[PDB]
Amino acid sequence: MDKFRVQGPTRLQGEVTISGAKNAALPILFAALLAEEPVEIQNVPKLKDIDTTMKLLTQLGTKVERXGSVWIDASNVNNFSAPYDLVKTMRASIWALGPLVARFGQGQVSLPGGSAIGARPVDLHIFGLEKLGAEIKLEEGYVKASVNGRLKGAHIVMDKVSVGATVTIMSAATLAEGTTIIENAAREPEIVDTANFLVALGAKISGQGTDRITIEGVERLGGGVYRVLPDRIETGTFLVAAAISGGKIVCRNAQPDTLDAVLAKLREAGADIETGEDWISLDMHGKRPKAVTVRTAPHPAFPTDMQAQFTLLNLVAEGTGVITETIFENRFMHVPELIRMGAHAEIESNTVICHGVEKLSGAQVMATDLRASASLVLAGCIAEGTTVVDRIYHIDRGYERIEDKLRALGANIERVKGE
Ligand SMILES: [NH3+]C1CCCCC1
């Protein structure tokens, strides 16, 4: 069980290169199952789910190899069943289903079970494919889908916003006969990226980024080269790292327009920010941040995946700021840990009232949520003394070696294997 021993305080300054977003690479890699010709997917991070996905695609008959790019040749996919042993560690595996049924007429994916029923993640994927004409068969543990002929474009109205089902429906719709219209579509930049990838292969999609996506089916998709967009959450994490340590940083290989709400909030906290075509710089001019008011909401509003980081920012800022979480009902586990680090905060239902203090003190802390864990590592960078963040594998699965990026910004951090 690896942990990070972090010693502070350190002002974080310098440059950091933003990695491709795993949440865009994953749906794009599964979308590549639709490609009849070789595809090169650029800027793919080296993370566990990517390895899991490459192994799964290989099991389906895809030829795959990687470095910064992942090269895919799906011309001869010939096994349309994704087995339990290859999907069990990854929910994103459901994304193999739509492309398999859309292109080959059959697909099956094993699904981890549960005693809980109703609103299980895969339900909207299933019902969306059913609306496109697929015949769905369910037995605990798996979903099999097939279609007699080609899928048929349909007007689908999503009752709740779902990034996963939007990707499944949009991707499968690219090879359906006719027009598919998705109402209340998820607007996330990763949806836009997946849509642009499909268009690069020959698909006809418009409206990506808005609540209504229109797909005009085509007979087949080809191949090409496509670069995965930058990880907007990783970017926000490094911007916050500088913002809370009186730092100065330049985030390279970034995409500013996927972060409008985050950059606006950082400017409210007192940051001097400039943006370029593929970069964002932030300078606190050595000052402590000013507390801000945050309300998470669906993209393009402020992202829940930046909530823990901004709570930390408020907890060392000047003033009182309230963070309201409207997306998840229990995403505040970082708070007790920070309070153990000397922070002053009160939880009131779906909000945390923060009363900024000048300095935190090191402690042994841990959070299972990826963003909460990474925020503890950032708190460790500015706290006096030693902070030990346990169960760092959560971070490793969503950030490409965060400690090396932080160390290059001046952090004193080390991976301790065990203790
Ligand atoms: N009997 C089959 C069901 C669909 C996927 C391939 C195996």
Tell whether ligand 1 has an atom less than 6 A from the beta carbon of residue 144: yes
DSSP SS3 for 369: coil
Q: How far away, in angstroms, is 101 Cα from ligand 1 center? A: 10
Nearest CA to ligand 1 atom 7: 81
Cα separation, 277 vs 108, in Å, equals 42
Cβ atoms of 16 and 410 within 8 Å: the answer is no
Whether domain 21-228 has CATH 3.30.300.30: no
Q: How far away, in angstroms, is 29 Cα from ligand 1 center? A: 21
Q: Which two tokens stand for residue 49?
A: 């789910």
Tell whether ligand 1 has an atom less than 6 A from the beta carbon of residue 80: yes
Residue 64 sits at the vertex; the CA angle it makes with 177 and 225, to the nearest 5 degrees, is 60
Evaluate the CA torsion angle 58, 151, 31, 51 in order and state its sign.
negative
Distances (CA, A) of 389 to 37, 312, 379, 408, 415: 45, 15, 10, 19, 10
Cβ atoms of 44 and 85 within 8 Å: the answer is no
Tell whether ligand 1 has an atom less than 6 A from the beta carbon of residue 106: yes
Cβ atoms of 342 and 361 within 8 Å: the answer is yes
Tell whether ligand 1 has an atom less than 6 A from the beta carbon of residue 107: yes
Residue 133 sits at the vertex; the CA angle it makes with 203 and 152, to the nearest 5 degrees, is 40
Residue 284, strand partner residues: none
The C-alpha R_g of the chain, in whole angstroms, comes to: 22
How many separate helices (H) and strands (E) can be counted in the chain? 14, 24
Contacts of 391 (CB under 8 A, 6+ apart): 1, 3, 366, 368, 373
Q: β-strands 63-66, 70-73: how paired? A: antiparallel
Evaluate the CA torsion angle 122, 127, 128, 133 in order and state its sign.
positive
First to last CA, the chain: 8
Whether domain 1-18+230-418 has CATH 1.10.3470.10: no
Q: Among the atoms of ligand 1, which is closest to the Cα of residue 106?
A: 4
Cα separation, 376 vs 148, in Å, equals 52
Cα separation, 30 vs 61, in Å, equals 13
Tell whether ligand 1 has an atom less than 6 A from the beta carbon of residue 81: yes
Q: Is 210 exposed, middle or buried (0-12, 13-18, 19+ CB in 10 A)?
A: exposed
Cα separation, 100 vs 31, in Å, equals 9
Structure-solving method: X-ray
Q: Among the atoms of ligand 1, which is closest to the Cα of residue 108?
A: 5
Q: What number of other Cβ atoms are within 10 A of residue 168's Cβ?
A: 29
Query: Which part of the chain is CATH 3.65.10.10?
Result: 1-18+230-418, 21-228
